[PDB]
């Protein structure tokens, strides 16, 4: 067949794309983090109303986040290069 000669490229593209996709469903989950050596209590922030004054500080609350550095651009650019290479052989 004619597709025999281009199997490794398709396999590599699939391998990279799976990880790129699955690293986006982990960054869509919300989890707060309250400092235990402080003075604010999570029971007051949950029973309030749409506009109210409660007691606490803003330094004791922060949110978990994914801090992967320059490990997104590299994979993305390699994937685009592979796709552009495959595009020239099938007359796209």
């Amino acid at each position: 067949s004619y597709c025999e000669e281009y199997l490794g490229d398709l396999n590599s593209l699939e391998t990279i794309t799976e990880a790129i996709t699955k690293m986006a469903k982990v960054a869509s989950k919300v989890v707060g983090l309250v400092n235990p050596n402080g003075i604010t209590q999570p029971r007051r922030l949950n029973k309030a109303a749409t506009g109210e004054f409660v007691a606490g500080r803003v330094e004791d609350i922060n949110f978990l986040q994914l801090t992967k550095g320059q490990d997104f651009t590299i994979a993305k650019s390699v994937a685009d290069a592979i796709e552009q290479r495959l595009g020239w052989a099938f007359l796209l």
Partner: protein
């Protein structure tokens, strides 16, 4: 099950379309020719090859 990428389908469909567009056109792709110099050794007029 759906593969993680959608680059193969486009390429395969595009190539399958173009190959058939080139191979089988609407106008005929045959000729059914007759040898030359054999009309010449047999004909007696200047309007025989055209009629054949």
């Amino acid at each position: 099950t759906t593969p993680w990428q959608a680059v193969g389908a486009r390429c395969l469909n595009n190539l399958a379309a173009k190959l058939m567009l080139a191979l089988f056109p609407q106008s005929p792709w045959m000729r059914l020719t007759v040898s030359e110099y054999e009309a010449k050794t047999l004909s007696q007029d200047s309007e025989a090859a055209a009629r054949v």
